[PDB]
Design a protein around this ligand. Structure first.
Ligand SMILES: CS(=O)(=O)c1nccn1Cc1cscn1
Length: 185
């Protein structure tokens, strides 16, 4: 792809994080802690899943960033509306304000409703995410496989400002402790 020149510097918003997440000093990495991280509750925190938002809000333009997923077994990545539900159970779908892909149980899927099987021959260690606000597009790229296309959501109805979206996944297996990392420009 040729989207690299739209690179934006994303940082994580601590205030939105589930209370078990540990975000690095530079706000560029996040991992699952083994316990509650001793923060106060607030209405912004995702309560039921290991989720966090980027601090940046987008309402126009073209934006690109990259995320390192090395050695993870499960995660979700993409964008979401600023006003998505934070508390309780919900599915990741465009109807609920999410444009995402995930890894789960050795396969990759797009967060449509119902979900869509992805076709990935080279498991990615880094993911590229491209948003074209005006066009209504969210696309995902396999950086490990020379930038090959993973998935495009088109005809998106964002209906609000967008924020970068992350889920580090649970670590029931003991094999999913590795962080998500925002990769340098
Ligand atoms: C916030 S929540 O959705 O976890 C919830 N709070 C009360 C009941 N449930 C449902 C539940 C518990 S185990 C799986 N689903």
């Amino acid at each position: 792809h040729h989207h690299h020149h739209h690179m934006v510097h994303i940082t994580l918003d601590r205030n939105t994080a589930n209370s078990w997440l540990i975000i690095s000093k530079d706000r560029r990495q996040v991992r699952m802690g083994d316990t509650h991280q001793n923060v106060s509750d607030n209405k912004e925190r995702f309560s039921n899943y290991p989720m966090v938002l980027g601090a940046q809000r987008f309402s126009s333009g073209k934006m690109y960033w990259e995320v390192d997923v090395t050695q993870k077994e499960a995660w979700d990545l993409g964008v979401c509306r600023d006003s998505v539900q934070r508390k309780g159970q919900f599915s990741l779908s465009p109807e609920n304000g999410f444009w995402t892909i995930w890894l789960w149980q050795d396969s990759y899927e797009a967060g449509t409703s119902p979900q869509t099987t992805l076709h990935i021959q080279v498991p990615p260690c880094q993911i590229g995410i491209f948003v074209d606000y005006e066009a209504g597009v969210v696309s995902f790229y396999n950086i490990t496989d020379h930038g090959s296309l993973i998935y495009t959501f088109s005809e998106c109805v964002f209906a609000g400002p967008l924020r970068p979206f992350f889920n580090v996944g649970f670590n029931y297996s003991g094999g999913n402790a590795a962080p998500l990392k925002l990769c340098p420009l």
